[PDB]
Design an enzyme around this catalytic site. Structure first.
Site: not given
Lengths: 276, 276, 275, 275
Positions: A96, A98, A252, A267
């Site tokens: 991915h 994000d 990632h 996060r």
């Protein structure tokens, strides 16, 4: 005393000697930022931290992003509580970058480890900068300037092992609200000006200026290429780890090998601008 | 007290609390042996040994291989010296299992890190056992009983030995000495009985009982499948590290990103039996 | 009645009969026996009208009366395709007709009314020849597996939505046709012959494999099943009749004649559940 | 002289000229032009003997002669391809003739003598049509790249035999035809039309790309260039003659007829260096 120790030539560095739970100096903040510019993904160990602190540290690098979806601590709403015992994580069977299905993909994120399984649950990161640099000249030329469709709908897991609640409706909701759009295929880092591949298997469906069949051939090439060991690192988590990475030039991957074991991360997402 | 610390669910464990620069106790030897059968690849840090200590240790786990053609230590020719000043490293540039083109590929190896670049030159391992278990049942059923051809020349074409008419004869002998031969696609570990994928991109040219076209599709699938993150670990080397892995059910990959930096490893190789 | 094979793999031209008029019980049987052997049958210089066409198609199975396209009034049993009225963005990928149905068409009768000078060939492939050419181990794995067929593979509208006027009919057929499954290896209900029953048009997933495994196998099957060895190519000529078994074949409509115009009548024969 | 196009991409049937005769400069010019447009030309009901076939083929270039192959006794300019005498395979991968040579054949003239009752079709594919259908970004990248062509890609060691007299003939041919390079986008030496000039039979690597990249790209090109849109399929009948331009096409011999006897006569026209 503030120390940057690279994990590999392509990307990643560990930082030591600066306590990010406190207010950091402008020299520190700068050195960290330069680190991020260089090694793209940064780890700090033995760095316990709370939402407020986490939020303040992250804010020193971009404006934070407080969102509706996912868990939020009672004090600071700009830190998500990702918890295995609650949420699910079948969104990460693939590489991915994000929210590339947004006009305005996040600049990066700061993620702290709170509770971990005995082992398993590594995260891999790959560098769009190293990966791009390694393509043949003819191929860099052809790609630089092309554009690609990123589409939320590609994230659809549904019933794979069927964890999804009758509420796959949250998913449907996000779909109807975020239409497919396009970003450069080769991106220029807003700050360092370094070029990275900016396609990811998570959301990229199509290279716009090639036909479907060509696009499919090329993306298959680029997904495998971008994620070769030469261009990636693999992080084994430890509690009180902080990972700080630049989502503008990396992908990632969260290794799913630890279920049903509980995993709790916090996060903080830093808002980013327009990819070009 | 000898401790074994799993590195990842799929494979790998770090071992400490044992001094392998001396002769180890039946008890230790045994716990390591089990640890090998369980975790498939083992690591010790801060465990400096000379060639002789390294040979004594490896010999505790099977018969050793005195290769009288590469740069080995004259006094204990069981230990091969891999120096990037003298020797090269073309071999590990692709996922392979060691010498599968031999009717009796190596059981495993003991590897000892002498001098290293600051960072770079990671080595990855992958478990044939975990990859195999991860395939869906219909795919397991088809492959279990198929055979595949392994061919030395696939990783070592003419271009490898050189341009000289001397290297050519040398090479044509090696090939005459190692015709393409076959192994089971799914190998049963001869001690643990655990089934493993036993193809590797380094030497596997063909699934025998399938058409070229079908074989090509299946191997491209298997090669990708078996080197996924879920089935692998990644070791960042430090001086005086020791790696001991079972080459009957794993693969490995040497990241090439340190050149021109100098890198020196000592390897001892334990002889294996016929895969079935 | 003359029957003249076109390839070892499939297809045969027919002559010595006139199908614009009812045929003897012996002629029909002979034809069905040709269709079962040769899988796709052609008739040249056989002019026909919706009425006769219907009459002929119906002697081989129950006829269909929709099917989301413009049809002749006198005979709702005969679809009229006219490149002037109706585009054809769904034929230039290999497909087997309506496999997204619980019970896909037995096959169709297609008549050539008006055609471009050249272009617009149609290709046919045999899932029987394709399957028998796979290695034993691969036939054994596949035989017994199932696959998802999804109506929305061969459309998604070119993402013509948002546009609403002409597309509401798309999400309708979509809602009315959720993805369903069929065996990857189909047993022909008459001949007992086994055939590959996946097609690139509609087949999205082999259910019992993972997605990566499925993806690999489907790329392999989609390529294998349309190699020269298993197909034939028909240059169309006005008044032609193509009659094919859609239970064990795929077909491909070459799109190379735009903007030239092309008109043909279809009778689709209803099918039963694949197994 | 009548030229009937078979498809927009390529192929035309010719008549109004008996090529078993000494034809006029004019008729010869018209034929060459038709070849330059359509890339592959067909004549039906054109019996011709080896003397005539050669006299015709020589009108378009110098011809290849004799050894070490089966030509007719008087005619070393015409190869006799019999199944009864010589087995044929790997004409069953797509290829352009002798691209591993520095100067691959301009084309060939092929006569059908004795055919199986059916089977043995040949497909041709237009490298001009296929180039033009690639997206601009792809055309721009490919146009200037070079690729390696290698005799041993399709004639690996195992097609010669474990016999020592075969490894001496193959090592010498392997030494006589080591791998070399041609442009990936060829400019027809006469018409200036541009074409993809890779083929699965002989092409191994795109030189200025990495192996990995070459692999993905060639896999794309091979599938693409042989799509139904850029090809035709000829069903042979005795006394057919096919005449193709090997500078800009690929072809495929369906192997579906053995052990039936197929006898063809071929004259090869010599070519020049591709750019």
């Amino acid at each position: 005393s503030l120390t940057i120790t690279p994990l590999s030539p392509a990307l990643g560095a560990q930082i030591s000697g600066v306590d990010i739970s406190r207010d950091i100096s402008a020299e520190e903040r700068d050195a960290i930022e330069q680190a991020l510019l260089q090694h793209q993904v940064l780890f700090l160990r033995d760095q316990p931290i709370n939402p407020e602190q986490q939020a303040r540290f992250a804010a020193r690098f971009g404006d934070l992003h407080i969102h509706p979806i996912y868990p939020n601590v009672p004090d600071t709403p700009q830190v998500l509580v990702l918890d295995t015992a609650v949420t699910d994580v079948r969104d990460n069977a693939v590489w991915h970058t994000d929210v590339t299905f947004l006009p305005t993909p996040a600049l990066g994120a700061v993620l702290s480890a709170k509770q971990l399984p005995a082992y398993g649950g590594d995260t891999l990161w790959a560098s769009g900068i190293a990966a791009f640099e390694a393509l043949s000249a003819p191929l860099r030329e052809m790609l630089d300037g092309l554009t690609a469709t990123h589409d939320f709908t590609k994230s659809f897991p549904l019933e794979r092992f069927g964890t999804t609640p009758q509420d796959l409706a949250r998913w449907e909701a996000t779909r109807r609200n975020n239409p497919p759009l396009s970003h450069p295929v080769v991106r220029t880092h807003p700050v360092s000006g370094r070029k990275a591949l900016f396609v990811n298997e998570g959301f990229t469906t199509r290279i716009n200026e090639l036909s479907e069949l060509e696009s499919d051939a090329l993306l298959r090439l680029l997904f495998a290429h971008a994620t070769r060991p030469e261009f990636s690192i693999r992080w084994r988590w430890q509690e009180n780890d902080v990972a700080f990475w630049d989502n503008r030039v990396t992908q990632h991957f969260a290794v799913d090998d630890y279920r049903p074991n509980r995993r709790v991360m916090h996060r903080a997402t830093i808002l980013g601008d327009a990819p070009f």
